[PDB]
Amino acid sequence: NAIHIGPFSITPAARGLHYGGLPHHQWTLYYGPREMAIKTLPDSYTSSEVRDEFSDIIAEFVIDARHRYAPDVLELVNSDGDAVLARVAVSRLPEALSGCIPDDRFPYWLLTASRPRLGLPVTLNEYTALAVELSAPPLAWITGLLPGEVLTHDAEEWRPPTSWELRHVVGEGSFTGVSGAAAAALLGMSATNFRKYTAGDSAANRQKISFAAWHYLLDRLGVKRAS
Amino acid sequence: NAIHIGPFSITPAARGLHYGGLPHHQWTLYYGPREMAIKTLPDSYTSSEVRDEFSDIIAEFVIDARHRYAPDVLELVNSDGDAVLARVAVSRLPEALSGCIPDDRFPYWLLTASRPRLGLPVTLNEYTALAVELSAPPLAWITGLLPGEVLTHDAEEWRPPTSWELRHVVGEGSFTGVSGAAAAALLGMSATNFRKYTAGDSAANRQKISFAAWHYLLDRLGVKRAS
Amino acid sequence: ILSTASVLAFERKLDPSDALMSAGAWAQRDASQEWPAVTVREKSVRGTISNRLKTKDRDPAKLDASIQSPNLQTVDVANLPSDADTLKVRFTLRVLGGAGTPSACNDAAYRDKLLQTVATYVNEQGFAELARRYAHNLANARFLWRNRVGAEAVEVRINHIRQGEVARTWRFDALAIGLRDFKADAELDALAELIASGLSGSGHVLLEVVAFARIGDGQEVFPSQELILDKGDKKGQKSKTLYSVRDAAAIHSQKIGNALRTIDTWYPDEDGLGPIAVEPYGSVTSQGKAYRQPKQKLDFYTLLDNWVLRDEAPAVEQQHYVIANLIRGGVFGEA
Amino acid sequence: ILSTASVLAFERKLDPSDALMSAGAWAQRDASQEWPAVTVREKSVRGTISNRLKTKDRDPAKLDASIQSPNLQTVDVANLPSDADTLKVRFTLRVLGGAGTPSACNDAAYRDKLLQTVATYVNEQGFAELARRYAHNLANARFLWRNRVGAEAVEVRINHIRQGEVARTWRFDALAIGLRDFKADAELDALAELIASGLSGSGHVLLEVVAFARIGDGQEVFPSQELILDKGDKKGQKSKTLYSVRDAAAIHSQKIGNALRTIDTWYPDEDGLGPIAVEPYGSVTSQGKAYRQPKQKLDFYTLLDNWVLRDEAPAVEQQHYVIANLIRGGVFGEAEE
Amino acid sequence: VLGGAGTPSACNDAAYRDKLLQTVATYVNEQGFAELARRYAHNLANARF
Amino acid sequence: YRQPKQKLDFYTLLDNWVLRDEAPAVEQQHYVIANLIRGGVFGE
């Protein structure tokens, strides 16, 4: 009786032991193939108790993945250098940046928040254009947990996600927290036709999601911008 | 031998006449059911000559549709009221607007470009957030030429576009100027499977485009933002 | 053998004039020769968005902004004067005859077959059913399209004018003769006999029709609307034009002719909705729907091709409909 | 399986005429057939600089130099005579009936579904609430828009005219009947039964409405204001035009029609402001605001589409509002803006 | 002389309208129109017109 | 007079009174309510 919380799985050890006189089982928490934790939990524990035994390790994983794969931050500052006027979390860099210290020849500069700053002089209209083009969605850090060949825009190199990669974004235990019914309603489908995507093996009536539906779903969940 | 330029069609009159001794035919230019023009063009005119006989009327239609269905413009101004610091073409209004004359209690205001101005005080970070959320794509005016029930996000009220509505955005004569091969490459499909969408009648092997593919295509063509 | 003609055209019978409007008082209807014409004026109209929104509930500030900048237009309007309550609408209508003869035809065998087919039609029964329905549509004032809706009393005077003076006078109460069903009456059948004698070619029929509608003092009448294309965008103030013969509000002659031939009660959908105007693929624009679709075998073209080429004479109601469409006239050919 | 028709159009019921203005003295209100009309005159106006200015302006040299060269206008104006203190406003009103049947419609299934929906509305209750509110708006002279404000005495005479003569007469004190609340009165309710008989198709209702407002000698009355079209005019033209019918100052018929249907009290914002005119997304131009915004489900189109397509009948006052909007008429359907 | 001197005939903002209405209301509660009506009665008394 | 460089014109006095709750002197309050009795078109 395994427990699935998004991409995490908690399985018992298939033969218990007797600790303190009481029967116990070893529960292992995996994140895919990577073994994250083992606990020795007694029998007559409900699956909810097994769930929030490992909820703290899952929450620490979420904090670490959210901090590690955070998108970049550009800062709009004035000509002196300090006094950040605006900030914008970008998923890409404006590609004209080249290491800059702002002077007073231009009133507005767009620097990186990283410390050897790169920067560009702007005039509040091209800053708005860059912020419109390059902004990051609120759940962009989940793109750090994905293989990148499922995130590419080139359809020659794209491959569809597996069920484990699909459970990163869709499901009640996923990092977006969006159920399969709501994700089916986002794509204009039924719940059963969308549950066909979340089976796991190609035999049990499972087809793969299409390029347009996957990228549109990543757009609508606020994960990838997908312009 | 009709001629199709996007959603426009130029048909001959099925029996000619003799004008000035030379044989002629009446060519009618339609925009769907609406009859736009009639000309009397001679025989021994190639289809290219029939095309740029009506190209000027088509260009005037494009100018009028681009000016009529232009998106709204918000202006970021300072506390005095004049001296527009930034402009942004939005496809929607920020919904907190309520008729405003800017004063010096706040240094930055976001007014409408329409003359009974609506406005809001902002602080260059929520202005960036509003411009990221509400910006208009470069070909948003084509959404004025579409029935709106093909543009809705609610999948209960959405219906797929017809072939004539699909020729507004896809095709060499369309208003986006994007061919069927490039639009197939945008959706990760083949040219033949995408040409199945552009037949016209349900008998001749034509299926309808899906909700996710249609909205993702409108996203990738720069027509609807489709967040 | 015996294919249909490539060109074929019929001039119309039952030619009406333009129907001119004037205003006066009820019970002065017999002195209604110096009644002044109803004039067309202009007025300013400020309105707001009462149409459906394209993006329904996704932009309330756009709605408030559009209400703060309302639509200003200039509209043509036509009312009765404030001291007169009766609209008088007058036109003339001539019935000619020679209904089967085309004004253009390519094949001589086709027009001889058509001429003998309509000759057998007249020989089996006269024009009496068609002329009875036309006299009904003259009896009720259906040519008052919206000027009859909600009228207190409608009264039609029909003068058969043989020489320069009137030869006969009919007087009908158009609210008694309904818009629904075709009844029988001695005066109505006498008028039908006159219309059928005009339709057969045995006489020259010229009628003067005058309708009096009792609407109310200063109320709005409805003439025909002109075309205002490509003037609603640059300035866009003039947004409605009413048709007028010189300084007098008028109804178009084709509108009167559409109200006259509203006789078709034989369309395969139903008959509980009432008569429609005769047309190939007999269709109503206000309903957006074609009765007598060509997928059914009851439009004008398949009926005429079966009656003429393959000698399959349809039912007597469908023969009435085909001869009514020949009376209406039109361009029938390979287009 | 049943969608809304793509075209759908309702002709209006409650058609008023243009309201004509005449002037006379009070207590000659019974001999008010030879009262002369209120004419429209011109006058000259010199204007100060009394609007807001930009920060590019408000420098004292520029403001004083703008005060040096003033602005001169010609203005249309309408007044009572100096020997008459009573404005008389006369119009006629047709109550017709047949309010459910559209004048144009695409779908036949939608047509008879809508027809039987209006039929169940009429079977459940008459037009008596709507006709009561319309008779209220006839009884208080709300069709005098600014000519009623600050008036000493307003009196309304309503003649129901069946044949060429008077069939019945009502006399109302329009300052007694409020513009706020909808009371009950036997004469007013009998007028409501007449109007409800007209709206039901059971008869032909024609009324003549006359209002007498005691304003004062020579005071300014307010006819309808026309729209002036001048492109490149020569510095001192007309800046205000007033509507007139044969040299008689007048109010537009749609102004009277807007003041007649000021019956919507059921909008979800509040009820302490008063009734507004029945509109889809019920909106007044003076406040610049749309009550019954479609984000709430109380605009006309979502109410009608729930009542007809999905059989979700709303509350009975929302049903009153939807039937009042059908009596108003309009172009509903996919001619969307 | 009519009354109702605080209420606008047309306005965009409802919140600004209520703030202005209560500001004029506090003006009336602090003192009546007696100074302004006194000056208007003076301008009526002398024939300045 | 009431030149807007000085803060005694009607618009600045009404804006300070209504927005910032800075009620002016009672004479200037008389002037503002006199302007509201006068009526006008106050807007951009």
PDB file of all heavy atoms in Angstrom, chain B residues 79-105:
ATOM      1  N   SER B  79       3.479  63.483 -11.333  1.00  0.00           N
ATOM      2  CA  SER B  79       2.447  64.058 -10.482  1.00  0.00           C
ATOM      3  C   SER B  79       1.831  65.325 -11.055  1.00  0.00           C
ATOM      4  O   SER B  79       0.727  65.696 -10.642  1.00  0.00           O
ATOM      5  CB  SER B  79       3.021  64.347  -9.099  1.00  0.00           C
ATOM      6  OG  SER B  79       4.194  65.133  -9.202  1.00  0.00           O
ATOM      7  N   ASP B  80       2.510  66.001 -11.983  1.00  0.00           N
ATOM      8  CA  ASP B  80       1.961  67.241 -12.521  1.00  0.00           C
ATOM      9  C   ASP B  80       0.804  66.990 -13.477  1.00  0.00           C
ATOM     10  O   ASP B  80      -0.137  67.788 -13.525  1.00  0.00           O
ATOM     11  CB  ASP B  80       3.056  68.053 -13.214  1.00  0.00           C
ATOM     12  CG  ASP B  80       3.816  67.250 -14.246  1.00  0.00           C
ATOM     13  OD1 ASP B  80       3.264  66.964 -15.328  1.00  0.00           O
ATOM     14  OD2 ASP B  80       4.974  66.887 -13.963  1.00  0.00           O
ATOM     15  N   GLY B  81       0.847  65.902 -14.239  1.00  0.00           N
ATOM     16  CA  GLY B  81      -0.225  65.607 -15.168  1.00  0.00           C
ATOM     17  C   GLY B  81       0.197  65.488 -16.618  1.00  0.00           C
ATOM     18  O   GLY B  81      -0.309  64.625 -17.338  1.00  0.00           O
ATOM     19  N   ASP B  82       1.107  66.345 -17.072  1.00  0.00           N
ATOM     20  CA  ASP B  82       1.639  66.230 -18.420  1.00  0.00           C
ATOM     21  C   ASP B  82       2.892  65.361 -18.370  1.00  0.00           C
ATOM     22  O   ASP B  82       3.127  64.657 -17.385  1.00  0.00           O
ATOM     23  CB  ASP B  82       1.913  67.607 -19.021  1.00  0.00           C
ATOM     24  CG  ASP B  82       0.646  68.366 -19.356  1.00  0.00           C
ATOM     25  OD1 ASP B  82      -0.429  67.729 -19.393  1.00  0.00           O
ATOM     26  OD2 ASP B  82       0.723  69.588 -19.603  1.00  0.00           O
ATOM     27  N   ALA B  83       3.691  65.397 -19.445  1.00  0.00           N
ATOM     28  CA  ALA B  83       4.996  64.734 -19.549  1.00  0.00           C
ATOM     29  C   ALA B  83       4.871  63.219 -19.351  1.00  0.00           C
ATOM     30  O   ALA B  83       5.233  62.669 -18.310  1.00  0.00           O
ATOM     31  CB  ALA B  83       6.019  65.342 -18.578  1.00  0.00           C
ATOM     32  N   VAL B  84       4.249  62.589 -20.352  1.00  0.00           N
ATOM     33  CA  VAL B  84       4.088  61.139 -20.372  1.00  0.00           C
ATOM     34  C   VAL B  84       5.441  60.451 -20.313  1.00  0.00           C
ATOM     35  O   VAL B  84       6.262  60.571 -21.229  1.00  0.00           O
ATOM     36  CB  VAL B  84       3.314  60.716 -21.627  1.00  0.00           C
ATOM     37  CG1 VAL B  84       2.963  59.252 -21.558  1.00  0.00           C
ATOM     38  CG2 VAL B  84       2.068  61.555 -21.772  1.00  0.00           C
ATOM     39  N   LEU B  85       5.674  59.717 -19.229  1.00  0.00           N
ATOM     40  CA  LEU B  85       6.932  59.013 -19.037  1.00  0.00           C
ATOM     41  C   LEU B  85       6.954  57.684 -19.769  1.00  0.00           C
ATOM     42  O   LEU B  85       7.993  57.293 -20.307  1.00  0.00           O
ATOM     43  CB  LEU B  85       7.186  58.777 -17.548  1.00  0.00           C
ATOM     44  CG  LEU B  85       6.906  59.951 -16.617  1.00  0.00           C
ATOM     45  CD1 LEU B  85       7.013  59.514 -15.176  1.00  0.00           C
ATOM     46  CD2 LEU B  85       7.865  61.080 -16.900  1.00  0.00           C
ATOM     47  N   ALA B  86       5.828  56.980 -19.801  1.00  0.00           N
ATOM     48  CA  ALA B  86       5.791  55.705 -20.501  1.00  0.00           C
ATOM     49  C   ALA B  86       4.402  55.468 -21.067  1.00  0.00           C
ATOM     50  O   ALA B  86       3.419  56.040 -20.602  1.00  0.00           O
ATOM     51  CB  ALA B  86       6.193  54.552 -19.582  1.00  0.00           C
ATOM     52  N   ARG B  87       4.331  54.606 -22.073  1.00  0.00           N
ATOM     53  CA  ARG B  87       3.070  54.195 -22.666  1.00  0.00           C
ATOM     54  C   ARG B  87       3.041  52.683 -22.784  1.00  0.00           C
ATOM     55  O   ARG B  87       4.071  52.047 -23.005  1.00  0.00           O
ATOM     56  CB  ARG B  87       2.865  54.801 -24.047  1.00  0.00           C
ATOM     57  CG  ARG B  87       2.369  56.220 -24.036  1.00  0.00           C
ATOM     58  CD  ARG B  87       2.099  56.692 -25.443  1.00  0.00           C
ATOM     59  NE  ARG B  87       1.534  58.033 -25.464  1.00  0.00           N
ATOM     60  CZ  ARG B  87       2.259  59.143 -25.505  1.00  0.00           C
ATOM     61  NH1 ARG B  87       3.582  59.070 -25.531  1.00  0.00           N
ATOM     62  NH2 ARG B  87       1.662  60.325 -25.522  1.00  0.00           N
ATOM     63  N   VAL B  88       1.853  52.109 -22.648  1.00  0.00           N
ATOM     64  CA  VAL B  88       1.700  50.667 -22.797  1.00  0.00           C
ATOM     65  C   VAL B  88       0.339  50.371 -23.413  1.00  0.00           C
ATOM     66  O   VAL B  88      -0.692  50.866 -22.950  1.00  0.00           O
ATOM     67  CB  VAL B  88       1.927  49.931 -21.455  1.00  0.00           C
ATOM     68  CG1 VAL B  88       1.111  50.532 -20.327  1.00  0.00           C
ATOM     69  CG2 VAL B  88       1.619  48.457 -21.596  1.00  0.00           C
ATOM     70  N   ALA B  89       0.343  49.601 -24.496  1.00  0.00           N
ATOM     71  CA  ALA B  89      -0.895  49.178 -25.137  1.00  0.00           C
ATOM     72  C   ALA B  89      -1.421  47.953 -24.408  1.00  0.00           C
ATOM     73  O   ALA B  89      -0.814  46.881 -24.456  1.00  0.00           O
ATOM     74  CB  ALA B  89      -0.663  48.885 -26.614  1.00  0.00           C
ATOM     75  N   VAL B  90      -2.544  48.111 -23.735  1.00  0.00           N
ATOM     76  CA  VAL B  90      -3.160  47.040 -22.974  1.00  0.00           C
ATOM     77  C   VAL B  90      -4.379  46.528 -23.720  1.00  0.00           C
ATOM     78  O   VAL B  90      -5.040  47.258 -24.471  1.00  0.00           O
ATOM     79  CB  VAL B  90      -3.540  47.501 -21.556  1.00  0.00           C
ATOM     80  CG1 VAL B  90      -2.296  47.757 -20.744  1.00  0.00           C
ATOM     81  CG2 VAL B  90      -4.384  48.748 -21.619  1.00  0.00           C
ATOM     82  N   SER B  91      -4.668  45.249 -23.508  1.00  0.00           N
ATOM     83  CA  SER B  91      -5.842  44.591 -24.054  1.00  0.00           C
ATOM     84  C   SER B  91      -6.982  44.528 -23.055  1.00  0.00           C
ATOM     85  O   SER B  91      -8.026  43.948 -23.358  1.00  0.00           O
ATOM     86  CB  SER B  91      -5.486  43.178 -24.507  1.00  0.00           C
ATOM     87  OG  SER B  91      -5.585  42.274 -23.425  1.00  0.00           O
ATOM     88  N   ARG B  92      -6.802  45.118 -21.881  1.00  0.00           N
ATOM     89  CA  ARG B  92      -7.769  45.057 -20.799  1.00  0.00           C
ATOM     90  C   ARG B  92      -7.437  46.183 -19.837  1.00  0.00           C
ATOM     91  O   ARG B  92      -6.316  46.692 -19.822  1.00  0.00           O
ATOM     92  CB  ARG B  92      -7.725  43.701 -20.097  1.00  0.00           C
ATOM     93  CG  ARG B  92      -9.000  43.274 -19.420  1.00  0.00           C
ATOM     94  CD  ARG B  92      -8.709  42.161 -18.443  1.00  0.00           C
ATOM     95  NE  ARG B  92      -7.699  41.251 -18.968  1.00  0.00           N
ATOM     96  CZ  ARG B  92      -6.939  40.467 -18.214  1.00  0.00           C
ATOM     97  NH1 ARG B  92      -7.072  40.485 -16.896  1.00  0.00           N
ATOM     98  NH2 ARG B  92      -6.043  39.672 -18.777  1.00  0.00           N
ATOM     99  N   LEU B  93      -8.407  46.564 -19.046  1.00  0.00           N
ATOM    100  CA  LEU B  93      -8.140  47.663 -18.143  1.00  0.00           C
ATOM    101  C   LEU B  93      -7.879  47.137 -16.734  1.00  0.00           C
ATOM    102  O   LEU B  93      -8.405  46.086 -16.358  1.00  0.00           O
ATOM    103  CB  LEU B  93      -9.311  48.655 -18.138  1.00  0.00           C
ATOM    104  CG  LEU B  93      -9.415  49.530 -19.391  1.00  0.00           C
ATOM    105  CD1 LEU B  93     -10.421  50.640 -19.198  1.00  0.00           C
ATOM    106  CD2 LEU B  93      -8.075  50.112 -19.784  1.00  0.00           C
ATOM    107  N   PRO B  94      -7.061  47.833 -15.934  1.00  0.00           N
ATOM    108  CA  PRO B  94      -6.618  47.272 -14.648  1.00  0.00           C
ATOM    109  C   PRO B  94      -7.683  47.141 -13.569  1.00  0.00           C
ATOM    110  O   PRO B  94      -7.322  46.770 -12.446  1.00  0.00           O
ATOM    111  CB  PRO B  94      -5.537  48.262 -14.202  1.00  0.00           C
ATOM    112  CG  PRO B  94      -5.037  48.847 -15.443  1.00  0.00           C
ATOM    113  CD  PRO B  94      -6.211  48.965 -16.339  1.00  0.00           C
ATOM    114  N   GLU B  95      -8.938  47.530 -13.823  1.00  0.00           N
ATOM    115  CA  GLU B  95     -10.134  47.164 -13.055  1.00  0.00           C
ATOM    116  C   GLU B  95     -10.204  47.861 -11.691  1.00  0.00           C
ATOM    117  O   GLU B  95     -11.233  47.819 -11.011  1.00  0.00           O
ATOM    118  CB  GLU B  95     -10.214  45.630 -12.937  1.00  0.00           C
ATOM    119  CG  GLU B  95     -11.528  45.031 -12.487  1.00  0.00           C
ATOM    120  CD  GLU B  95     -11.316  43.749 -11.729  1.00  0.00           C
ATOM    121  OE1 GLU B  95     -10.982  43.816 -10.528  1.00  0.00           O
ATOM    122  OE2 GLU B  95     -11.477  42.672 -12.339  1.00  0.00           O
ATOM    123  N   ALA B  96      -9.152  48.573 -11.310  1.00  0.00           N
ATOM    124  CA  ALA B  96      -9.185  49.454 -10.157  1.00  0.00           C
ATOM    125  C   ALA B  96      -9.263  50.913 -10.562  1.00  0.00           C
ATOM    126  O   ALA B  96      -9.200  51.789  -9.697  1.00  0.00           O
ATOM    127  CB  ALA B  96      -7.957  49.223  -9.277  1.00  0.00           C
ATOM    128  N   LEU B  97      -9.389  51.185 -11.856  1.00  0.00           N
ATOM    129  CA  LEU B  97      -9.438  52.551 -12.343  1.00  0.00           C
ATOM    130  C   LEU B  97     -10.765  53.201 -11.987  1.00  0.00           C
ATOM    131  O   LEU B  97     -11.820  52.565 -12.038  1.00  0.00           O
ATOM    132  CB  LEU B  97      -9.243  52.575 -13.854  1.00  0.00           C
ATOM    133  CG  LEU B  97      -8.007  51.903 -14.439  1.00  0.00           C
ATOM    134  CD1 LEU B  97      -7.903  52.235 -15.904  1.00  0.00           C
ATOM    135  CD2 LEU B  97      -6.763  52.352 -13.718  1.00  0.00           C
ATOM    136  N   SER B  98     -10.699  54.477 -11.629  1.00  0.00           N
ATOM    137  CA  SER B  98     -11.876  55.278 -11.326  1.00  0.00           C
ATOM    138  C   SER B  98     -11.446  56.726 -11.422  1.00  0.00           C
ATOM    139  O   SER B  98     -10.469  57.100 -10.769  1.00  0.00           O
ATOM    140  CB  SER B  98     -12.420  54.982  -9.929  1.00  0.00           C
ATOM    141  OG  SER B  98     -11.643  55.639  -8.944  1.00  0.00           O
ATOM    142  N   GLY B  99     -12.214  57.530 -12.171  1.00  0.00           N
ATOM    143  CA  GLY B  99     -11.833  58.817 -12.740  1.00  0.00           C
ATOM    144  C   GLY B  99     -10.977  59.748 -11.913  1.00  0.00           C
ATOM    145  O   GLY B  99     -11.356  60.136 -10.809  1.00  0.00           O
ATOM    146  N   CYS B 100      -9.802  60.086 -12.433  1.00  0.00           N
ATOM    147  CA  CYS B 100      -8.746  60.656 -11.618  1.00  0.00           C
ATOM    148  C   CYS B 100      -8.087  61.833 -12.310  1.00  0.00           C
ATOM    149  O   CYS B 100      -7.856  61.809 -13.519  1.00  0.00           O
ATOM    150  CB  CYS B 100      -7.683  59.608 -11.289  1.00  0.00           C
ATOM    151  SG  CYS B 100      -6.374  60.181 -10.216  1.00  0.00           S
ATOM    152  N   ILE B 101      -7.788  62.856 -11.525  1.00  0.00           N
ATOM    153  CA  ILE B 101      -6.845  63.907 -11.886  1.00  0.00           C
ATOM    154  C   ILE B 101      -5.636  63.755 -10.971  1.00  0.00           C
ATOM    155  O   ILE B 101      -5.795  63.770  -9.744  1.00  0.00           O
ATOM    156  CB  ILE B 101      -7.464  65.304 -11.752  1.00  0.00           C
ATOM    157  CG1 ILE B 101      -8.803  65.357 -12.476  1.00  0.00           C
ATOM    158  CG2 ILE B 101      -6.526  66.342 -12.315  1.00  0.00           C
ATOM    159  CD1 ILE B 101      -9.531  66.650 -12.303  1.00  0.00           C
ATOM    160  N   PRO B 102      -4.433  63.570 -11.508  1.00  0.00           N
ATOM    161  CA  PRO B 102      -3.267  63.339 -10.650  1.00  0.00           C
ATOM    162  C   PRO B 102      -2.857  64.578  -9.869  1.00  0.00           C
ATOM    163  O   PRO B 102      -2.833  65.691 -10.397  1.00  0.00           O
ATOM    164  CB  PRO B 102      -2.177  62.933 -11.645  1.00  0.00           C
ATOM    165  CG  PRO B 102      -2.645  63.418 -12.952  1.00  0.00           C
ATOM    166  CD  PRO B 102      -4.124  63.330 -12.923  1.00  0.00           C
ATOM    167  N   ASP B 103      -2.532  64.368  -8.600  1.00  0.00           N
ATOM    168  CA  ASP B 103      -1.973  65.387  -7.725  1.00  0.00           C
ATOM    169  C   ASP B 103      -0.582  64.945  -7.275  1.00  0.00           C
ATOM    170  O   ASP B 103      -0.046  63.940  -7.744  1.00  0.00           O
ATOM    171  CB  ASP B 103      -2.892  65.649  -6.532  1.00  0.00           C
ATOM    172  CG  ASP B 103      -3.429  64.380  -5.926  1.00  0.00           C
ATOM    173  OD1 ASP B 103      -3.843  63.495  -6.694  1.00  0.00           O
ATOM    174  OD2 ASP B 103      -3.441  64.264  -4.685  1.00  0.00           O
ATOM    175  N   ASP B 104       0.003  65.708  -6.358  1.00  0.00           N
ATOM    176  CA  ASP B 104       1.365  65.468  -5.905  1.00  0.00           C
ATOM    177  C   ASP B 104       1.440  64.628  -4.640  1.00  0.00           C
ATOM    178  O   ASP B 104       2.499  64.578  -4.011  1.00  0.00           O
ATOM    179  CB  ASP B 104       2.088  66.796  -5.685  1.00  0.00           C
ATOM    180  CG  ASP B 104       1.224  67.823  -4.993  1.00  0.00           C
ATOM    181  OD1 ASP B 104       0.197  67.441  -4.397  1.00  0.00           O
ATOM    182  OD2 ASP B 104       1.555  69.023  -5.069  1.00  0.00           O
ATOM    183  N   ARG B 105       0.349  63.970  -4.249  1.00  0.00           N
ATOM    184  CA  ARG B 105       0.429  63.033  -3.136  1.00  0.00           C
ATOM    185  C   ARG B 105       1.181  61.770  -3.525  1.00  0.00           C
ATOM    186  O   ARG B 105       1.704  61.068  -2.654  1.00  0.00           O
ATOM    187  CB  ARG B 105      -0.966  62.670  -2.643  1.00  0.00           C
ATOM    188  CG  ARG B 105      -1.659  63.764  -1.874  1.00  0.00           C
ATOM    189  CD  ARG B 105      -3.034  63.306  -1.460  1.00  0.00           C
ATOM    190  NE  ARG B 105      -3.805  62.875  -2.616  1.00  0.00           N
ATOM    191  CZ  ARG B 105      -4.822  62.026  -2.559  1.00  0.00           C
ATOM    192  NH1 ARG B 105      -5.190  61.511  -1.396  1.00  0.00           N
ATOM    193  NH2 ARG B 105      -5.466  61.690  -3.664  1.00  0.00           N
TER     194      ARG B 105
END
